[model samples]
Target: CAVELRSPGISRFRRKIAKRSIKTLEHKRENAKE
Candidate 1:
């Protein structure tokens, strides 16, 4: 998971971003099992 701050202001004015995919989650789960 990842997060970015585009601006400084009220929560409504801020920007929240994240990137993910089914493959990524699957990989993470595999690692957790290790």
Candidate 2:
């Protein structure tokens, strides 16, 4: 069963990178699985 829960925080995640932040965290869970 697809029991994935949705949250409001998910909306805040944008695909934008910053110059200060390292590339450790990103909204790419699907790409990481590959």
Candidate 3:
């Protein structure tokens, strides 16, 4: 199954990837959790 990423928490998706290697902020994901 494909992962779902809901906004406004996508963190400018491309911005993170462009910053060398993409990564996640634990706190942010926690908040995004349904």
Candidate 4:
């Protein structure tokens, strides 16, 4: 369920959904920095 994101384990799912040329962490981190 999408509600699973509300939990602390979201990193797994977030990583699963976050597709980028680089790692999801780097992509999200770069985007968030702006």
TM for every model, in the order presented, reads 0.29, 0.16, 0.24, 0.28
Compared with the true structure, what per-residue lDDT tens digits does model 2 show for residues 1-34?
3333554443344434442253544545644866
Candidates 2 and 3 compared by TM-score, better number:
3
Among all windows of ten consecutive residues in candidate 2, which has the lowest summed lDDT?
Answer: 11-20
- Ten-residue stretch with the least lDDT total in model 3: 1-10
Model 3 misplaced stretches (Cα beyond 4 Å): 1-11, 21-34
Residue-level error in angstroms, candidate 2, position 33: 3.5
- For candidate 1, report its TM-score: 0.29
Query: What would the C-alpha RMSD of candidate 2 be, to one decimal place?
Result: 11.3
What lDDT, from 0 to 1, does candidate 1 have?
A: 0.50
Kindly report the root-mean-square deviation of model 3 from the true structure over all alpha carbons. Answer: 13.2
Which tens-of-lDDT digit does each residue in 1-34 have in candidate 4? Answer: 6645567576766666665545756767687856
Leading candidate by lDDT = 4
lDDT of 4 at 14: 68
Name the candidate, 1 or 2, with the larger TM-score value. 1
Q: What clash count goes with each model?
A: 0, 0, 0, 0
Instruction: For model 2, state the Cα shift of residue 31 in Å.
Output: 0.1
Residue pairs of candidate 3 with colliding backbone atoms:
none
C-alpha positional error of residue 28 in candidate 1 after TM-score superposition, expressed in Å: 0.3
